[PDB]
Design a protein around this ligand. Structure first.
Ligand SMILES: [Cl-]
Length: 268
């Protein structure tokens, strides 16, 4: 007999009542194949969380373009937008593709992400990479900062928790990328600095976690996805996304962490 998904769902529903919005969750245990799924196929805005997949797409390109990662991109002030703490620091010099990738992943640097999008042929180039690995859900249409608008009903710049988790599994654990590139993505995710109050807050400190966060700043819309390696066990991949119906609904990192905890604990 299969899981009683209504019982697995109940505490997510309770969480979203106090939150005042919708929570989307997908978690997969790569050892047992067990899953937890709650609104897992609903669309939620990506916000900054596209930057993880961006770095993977850049790593894919590097497989066919030797020394791409160590190539400096030297930019003018038009590259710059707010929430770009690393790229602003190197305006007078430039940054390598690898430095930009690390910055986008680990500091959620906006301008760095736009610079790397340009390398891939824009938002459509990243979406095309995601289609190449069998993600039919992911769509990035716009650039920083417009992609954060998170307007209710807009499908642009969204994915689902399930598609996010599936794609993350393929890229970090599966062989979608070559081994050095796969390990480079995992290392960038593991060094994220912005996720300490989200999925990481739900995971014992001694277990390795790599993650990427998103915070649109409107419509209670924020997220995190991660790979989690419990010591001596098969890794877990999971995604937690929120949204809410009013522009001024607050996002909550506490809700994200609680949803992560519920998801991780529900896995068979
Ligand atoms: Cl310029």
């Amino acid at each position: 007999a299969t899981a009683l998904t209504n019982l697995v769902a109940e505490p997510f529903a309770k969480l979203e009542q106090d939150f005042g919005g919708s929570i989307g969750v997908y978690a997969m245990d790569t050892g047992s194949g067990a899953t937890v799924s709650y609104r897992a196929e609903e669309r939620f805005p990506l916000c900054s969380s596209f930057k993880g997949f961006l770095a993977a797409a850049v790593l894919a390109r590097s497989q066919q373009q030797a020394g791409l990662l160590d190539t400096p991109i030297r930019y003018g002030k038009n590259a710059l937008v707010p929430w770009s703490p690393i790229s602003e620091k190197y305006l007078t010099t430039g940054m390598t593709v690898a430095e930009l990738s690390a910055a986008a992943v680990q500091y959620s640097d906006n301008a760095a992400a736009n610079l790397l999008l340009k390398e891939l042929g824009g938002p459509a180039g990243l979406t095309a990479f995601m289609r190449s690995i069998g993600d039919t859900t992911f769509r990035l249409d716009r650039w920083e900062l417009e992609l954060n608008s998170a307007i209710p009903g807009d499908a642009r710049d969204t994915s689902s928790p399930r598609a996010v988790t599936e794609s993350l599994q393929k890229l970090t654990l599966g062989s979608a990328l070559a081994a050095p590139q796969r390990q480079q993505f995992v290392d960038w995710l593991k060094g994220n600095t912005t996720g300490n109050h989200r999925i990481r807050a739900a995971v014992p400190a001694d277990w390795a976690v790599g993650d990427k966060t998103g915070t649109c700043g409107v419509y209670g819309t924020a997220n995190d996805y991660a790979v989690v390696w419990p010591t001596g066990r098969a890794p877990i991949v999971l995604a937690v996304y929120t949204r809410a119906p009013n522009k001024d609904d607050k996002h909550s990192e506490a809700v994200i962490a609680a949803a992560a905890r519920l998801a991780l604990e529900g896995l068979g």
